[PDB]
Amino acid sequence: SGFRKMAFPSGKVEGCMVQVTCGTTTLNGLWLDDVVYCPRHVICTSEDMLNPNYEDLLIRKSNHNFLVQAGNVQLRVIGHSMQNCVLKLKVDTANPKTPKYKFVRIQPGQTFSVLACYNGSPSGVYQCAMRPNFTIKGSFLNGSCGSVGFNIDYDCVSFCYMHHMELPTGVHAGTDLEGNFYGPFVDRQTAQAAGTDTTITVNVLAWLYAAVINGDRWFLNRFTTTLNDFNLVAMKYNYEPLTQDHVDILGPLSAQTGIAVLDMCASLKELLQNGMNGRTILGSALLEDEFTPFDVVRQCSGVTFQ
Amino acid sequence: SGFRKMAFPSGKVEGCMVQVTCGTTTLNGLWLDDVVYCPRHVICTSEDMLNPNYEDLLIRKSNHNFLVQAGNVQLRVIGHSMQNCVLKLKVDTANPKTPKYKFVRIQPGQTFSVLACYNGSPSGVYQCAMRPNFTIKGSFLNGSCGSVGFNIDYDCVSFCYMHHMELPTGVHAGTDLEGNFYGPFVDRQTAQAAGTDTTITVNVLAWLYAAVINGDRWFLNRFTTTLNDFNLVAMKYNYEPLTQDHVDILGPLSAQTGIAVLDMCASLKELLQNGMNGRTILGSALLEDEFTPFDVVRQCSGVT
Numbered sequence: 001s002g003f004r005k006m007a008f009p010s011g012k013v014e015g016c017m018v019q020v021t022c023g024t025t026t027l028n029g030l031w032l033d034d035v036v037y038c039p040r041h042v043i044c045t046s047e048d049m050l051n052p053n054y055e056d057l058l059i060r061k062s063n064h065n066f067l068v069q070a071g072n073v074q075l076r077v078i079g080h081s082m083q084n085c086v087l088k089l090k091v092d093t094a095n096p097k098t099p100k101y102k103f104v105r106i107q108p109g110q111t112f113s114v115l116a117c118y119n120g121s122p123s124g125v126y127q128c129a130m131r132p133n134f135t136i137k138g139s140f141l142n143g144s145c146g147s148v149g150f151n152i153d154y155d156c157v158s159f160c161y162m163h164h165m166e167l168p169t170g171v172h173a174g175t176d177l178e179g180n181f182y183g184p185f186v187d188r189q190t191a192q193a194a195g196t197d198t199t200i201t202v203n204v205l206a207w208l209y210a211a212v213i214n215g216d217r218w219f220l221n222r223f224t225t226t227l228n229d230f231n232l233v234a235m236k237y238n239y240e241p242l243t244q245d246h247v248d249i250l251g252p253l254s255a256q257t258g259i260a261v262l263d264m265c266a267s268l269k270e271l272l273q274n275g276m277n278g279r280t281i282l283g284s285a286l287l288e289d290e291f292t293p294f295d296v297v298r299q300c301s302g303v304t305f306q
Numbered sequence: 307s308g309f310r311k312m313a314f315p316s317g318k319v320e321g322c323m324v325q326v327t328c329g330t331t332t333l334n335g336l337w338l339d340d341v342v343y344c345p346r347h348v349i350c351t352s353e354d355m356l357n358p359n360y361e362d363l364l365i366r367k368s369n370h371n372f373l374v375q376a377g378n379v380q381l382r383v384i385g386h387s388m389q390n391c392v393l394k395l396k397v398d399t400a401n402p403k404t405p406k407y408k409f410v411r412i413q414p415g416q417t418f419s420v421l422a423c424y425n426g427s428p429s430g431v432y433q434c435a436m437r438p439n440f441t442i443k444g445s446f447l448n449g450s451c452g453s454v455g456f457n458i459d460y461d462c463v464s465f466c467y468m469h470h471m472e473l474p475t476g477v478h479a480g481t482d483l484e485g486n487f488y489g490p491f492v493d494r495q496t497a498q499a500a501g502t503d504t505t506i507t508v509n510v511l512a513w514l515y516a517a518v519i520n521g522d523r524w525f526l527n528r529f530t531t532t533l534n535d536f537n538l539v540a541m542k543y544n545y546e547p548l549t550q551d552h553v554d555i556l557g558p559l560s561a562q563t564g565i566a567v568l569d570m571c572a573s574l575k576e577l578l579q580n581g582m583n584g585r586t587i588l589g590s591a592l593l594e595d596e597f598t599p600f601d602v603v604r605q606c607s608g609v610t
């Protein structure tokens with residue numbers, strides 16, 4: 001038994017990571033078919049950080065100003081263009097390791113794996129959630145910009161995130177693979193409020209179901225509640241409101257454990273109002289919100305990939 | 307910045323995972339050069355589980371009793387032998403995806419990544435520590451037997467663990483890649499005690515340094531302690547005793563942060579005696595012991 005915050009196997013994404021240099025800036029790019037994707041701030045200099053005019057900066061660049069290196073191989077750049085906040089470099093060779101892939105824009109509270117890379121070289125992989133305020137609590141040292149987040153379905157990689165920046169608060173912000181930021185953020189070095197973060201309620205509930213499946217039961221209380229009553233408590237404790245859609249995706253776990261969703265909500269309500277009293281759940285003293293209901297079902301089912 | 311429990315990128319190991327079937331038992335194997343490694347209990351039947359005589363059971367098997375599938379393609383087994391608790395199936399094809407590799411036996415408290423596989427296919431990857439009692443806290447679904455644990459040094463994979471069994475407590479036990487179990491365990495379906503686990507003190511200290519590097523400094527004090535005095539407290543809270551070797555390996559973190567090792571020990575001593583009183587460290591309400599000093603340095607310096 002047990003429960004780990006597992007990441008997706010990263011091999012299919014490892015084969016897509018390249019290094020992109022423009023001027024004196026070097027970061028990570030994603031090479032799929034004959035296109036390399038990377039953050040457009042690769043064209044900034046240290047003098048351009050506070051408010052770059054990306055259109056004017058890019059007009060100064062030609063194809064030969066972009067150095068793209070895949071391992072030891074130098075790729076020939078035959079076109080460049082900007083799509084929102086992502087630079088797209090057309091190269092003259094398709095990546096022979098291109099997996100089946102999609103570009104997806106995920107919802108706040110959904111999870112994905114990040115392949116943290118530095119200067120084109122994979123460093124580590126970890127699983128995380130897109131916070132309700134559209135930030136990531138990652139591990140991104142300088143040189144990790146352009147690292148990507150993804151999910152896998154059997155043999156198809158769904159890319160959902162590209163890392164662009166660390167905010168002054170220490171949290172991380174990025175885009176989908178069409179270059180549109182998650183959240184209100186812009187790619188310039190300024191103070192930017194992320195606004196109130198909240199706890200992903202449906203994920204906490206899923207993790208409580210995981211705990212029951214692993215043999216925990218001390219927090220199962222004698223109460224039930226209603227959706228409206230629970231959401232009164234959720235808002236008081238900066239938890240995301242629960243919808244019937246959330247209740248529906250919790251259905252499989254409720255069926256397996258025999259614990260009606262609103263009963264588990266009542267037990268979560270008691271934990272929020274009474275605290276943990278020094279007790280742990282799945283070894284944790286805080287409530288965990290980086291497992292989606294699907295994540296729990298996958299691990300409990302031993303779902304595998306190519 | 308930020309600090310995550312990162313696993314190694316799994317691609318080099320993914321290319322080595324195969325499916326091994328003997329009779330009606332199917333589990334994971336590791337294909338390196340022209341050898342496939344898997345737990346020898348693949349040759350057990352349901353009536354063999356309580357006390358298998360593996361030498362007798364293997365004698366009844368020939369090469370054609372082993373079905374190895376790599377992707378959609380059957381590999382021809384041309385030889386078989388038992389090394390301690392691992393079965394080595396010689397195949398007629400060298401794995402073309404064999405990475406540079408070594409087999410290593412790790413120490414209790416060291417960390418590695420596990421590629422959790424079922425029936426030859428990966429489910430996910432996670433970072434873990436070998437507990438001081440030589441067990442592993444793994445993923446949920448039983449039957450990932452033959453999945454491996456590893457570290458990567460640039461392009462070279464150091465395999466250190468093969469999963470063999472879940473103990474009745476649910477924790478995982480396994481071998482090195484020469485088939486020697488970590489801990490006292492045997493590959494039989496019997497009640498087996500793992501004995502007292504302890505917290506990996508040198509790892510907690512490393513993680514406290516990681517917290518200071520990331521801006522959490524509230525637990526620092528200017529109290530002095532000695533190794534002997536610290537260990538008096540650590541033993542009371544079921545922490546592993548700290549040795550001079552442990553102090554020595556924390557040196558690089560002391561050197562980059564400006565916090566002496568014994569100063570961090572005095573900070574941990576106060577944390578154990580006083581508790582955290584509702585405060586968190588790196589977002590955690592409990593002290594984390596699954597980062598080695600080397601792990602912290604790697605992550606904080608961006609090794610790839």
Ligand SMILES: *c1c(-c2oc3cc(OC)cc(O)c3c(=O)c2O)cc(O)c(O)c1O
Pocket residue numbers: 025026027028041044048049052142143144145146164165166167187188189190
């Ligand atoms: C990552 C970065 C990198 O670049 C930026 C650019 C910004 O505005 C143009 C803002 C911002 O917050 C930011 C970062 O946080 C950040 O990490 C820069 C360089 O040179 C490299 O190599 C990265 O990997």
Ligand SMILES: *c1c(-c2oc3cc(OC)cc(O)c3c(=O)c2O)cc(O)c(O)c1O
Pocket residue numbers: 331332333334347350354355356358448449450451452470471472473493494495496
């Ligand atoms: C994993 C196992 C598997 O096998 C064993 C065998 C044991 O003694 C012979 C003991 C033991 O505790 C044990 C396990 O916990 C365990 O998971 C069996 C099968 O069939 C498959 O497919 C595995 O992956």
